[PDB]
Amino acid sequence: SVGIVYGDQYRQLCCSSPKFGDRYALVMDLINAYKLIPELSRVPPLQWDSPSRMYEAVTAFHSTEYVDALKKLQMLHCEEKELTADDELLMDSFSLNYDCPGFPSVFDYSLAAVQGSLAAASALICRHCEVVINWGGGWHHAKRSEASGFCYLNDIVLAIHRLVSSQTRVLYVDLDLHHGDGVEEAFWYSPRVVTFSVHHASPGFFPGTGTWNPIFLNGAGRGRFSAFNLPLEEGINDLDWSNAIGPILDSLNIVIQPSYVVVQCGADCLATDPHRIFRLTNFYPSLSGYLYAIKKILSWKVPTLILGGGGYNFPDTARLWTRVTALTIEEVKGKKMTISPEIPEHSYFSRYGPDFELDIDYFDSIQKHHRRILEQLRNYADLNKLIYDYDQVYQLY
Numbered sequence: 001s002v003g004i005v006y007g008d009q010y011r012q013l014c015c016s017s018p019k020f021g022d023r024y025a026l027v028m029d030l031i032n033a034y035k036l037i038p039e040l041s042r043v044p045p046l047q048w049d050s051p052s053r054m055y056e057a058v059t060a061f062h063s064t065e066y067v068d069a070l071k072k073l074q075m076l077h078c079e080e081k082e083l084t085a086d087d088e089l090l091m092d093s094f095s096l097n098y099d100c101p102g103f104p105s106v107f108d109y110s111l112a113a114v115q116g117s118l119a120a121a122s123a124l125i126c127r128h129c130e131v132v133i134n135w136g137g138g139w140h141h142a143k144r145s146e147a148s149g150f151c152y153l154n155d156i157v158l159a160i161h162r163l164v165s166s167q168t169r170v171l172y173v174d175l176d177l178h179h180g181d182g183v184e185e186a187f188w189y190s191p192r193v194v195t196f197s198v199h200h201a202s203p204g205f206f207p208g209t210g211t212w213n214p215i216f217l218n219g220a221g222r223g224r225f226s227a228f229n230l231p232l233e234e235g236i237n238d239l240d241w242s243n244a245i246g247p248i249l250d251s252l253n254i255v256i257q258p259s260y261v262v263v264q265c266g267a268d269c270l271a272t273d274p275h276r277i278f279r280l281t282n283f284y285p286s287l288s289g290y291l292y293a294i295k296k297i298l299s300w301k302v303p304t305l306i307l308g309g310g311g312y313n314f315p316d317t318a319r320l321w322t323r324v325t326a327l328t329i330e331e332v333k334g335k336k337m338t339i340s341p342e343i344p345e346h347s348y349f350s351r352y353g354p355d356f357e358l359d360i361d362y363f364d365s366i367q368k369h370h371r372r373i374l375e376q377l378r379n380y381a382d383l384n385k386l387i388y389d390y391d392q393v394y395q396l397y
């Protein structure tokens with residue numbers, strides 16, 4: 001089946017943050033408005049037997065002291081009184097400040113994504129679902145003891161850890177506009193989790209990694225060559241973005257033969273995202289780079305976790321992820337999803353004006369990266385004794 005994470009409490013928590021507002025509600029309600037919910041298996045978020053079991057799960061990646069501080073931040077933001085200087089300094093030591101502020105539900109909000117993505121991983125492991133979608137997850141920037149980029153807990157890392165610990169290899173594909181630094185770092189020393197991020201990178205652009213640092217770092221220790229990156233200049237359209245990552249994706253699957261694929265599908269590469277950097281679309285006849293990538297990953301018939309992430313044009317993010325959800329149903333079940341070009345009437349219909357259409361309202365370096373990435377993949381296969389056909393992989397590019 002195709003699973004999707006939702007629930008009443010989950011929805012409330014995913015809509016409780018100042019940065020992402022009600023985005024998750026728009027996403028799930030547009031999926032509902034297009035009558036996709038009956039096609040999908042609801043995956044309930046994971047809950048625990050006790051505080052200690054919860055800490056045991058979250059501190060599989062995060063430090064106890066960081067989790068403590070994040071919970072304290074929520075507590076402090078539920079009281080009217082201003083933080084003490086000592087508490088401000090404590091929060092600063094975990095980067096729980098500036099772009100990762102406190103708010104009254106910050107811990108419950110952050111933990112909810114973890115609950116959803118851990119449940120999604122478990123549904124894949126027990127083979128209840130062949131693919132699971134979590135549009136409340138995908139928070140790729142959070143580090144062991146540091147919040148970053150409005151990511152407080154790294155649900156992706158925790159989900160991947162569950163998968164790899166269930167020879168199991170996981171391929172992580174990060175389609176967000178931003179470099180997936182938190183996930184890359186978590187598995188920097190781990191050959192069995194290969195990370196691949198395609199992203200914009202340029203001087204001063206967040207978070208700064210995923211590019212020449214100069215040479216290209218790619219993992220360390222036994223994880224050498226296991227972290228892949230494709231930085232792209234601003235302005236790239238569906239076709240060029242698709243041709244840039246298509247052969248890399250196919251080569252990674254052929255060589256790594258992953259037992260699971262985890263995809264972060266942040267929507268901030270859309271031409272209409274307020275970042276205004278890439279020119280991708282949700283068009284489904286150019287073909288949306290996102291849909292091209294997802295279709296290609298699902299053609300591998302590997303159990304796959306599809307997560308959300310960035311996306312700051314909330315209606316267009318719902319437009320894109322609704323099409324990703326329909327495409328996943330089609331590819332996995334084999335059942336054609338016919339979707340009207342009109343946004344159906346529903347709770348948030350007015351948010352899609354004035355056009356009220358499903359299509360978003362939008363009218364050599366890469367060759368060098370391919371040669372570099374192919375060489376790195378050969379080095380990865382050699383170091384990890386993976387038998388693969390070099391000529392066939394070369395023909396993909």
Ligand SMILES: O=C(NO)c1cccc(C(=O)Nc2ccccc2)c1
Pocket residue numbers: 141149150176177178206266268274275309310311312
């Ligand atoms: O998506 C991200 N990382 O995957 C990310 C990380 C840090 C900051 C922002 C950010 O604030 N973006 C934004 C730009 C313009 C308008 C609204 C929001 C986004």
Ligand SMILES: [K+]
Pocket residue numbers: 174175176177178179180197198199
């Ligand atoms: K990315």
Ligand SMILES: [K+]
Pocket residue numbers: 187188189190191192193194195219223226227
């Ligand atoms: K790795």
Ligand SMILES: [Zn+2]
Pocket residue numbers: 176177178266268309310311
């Ligand atoms: Zn992003």
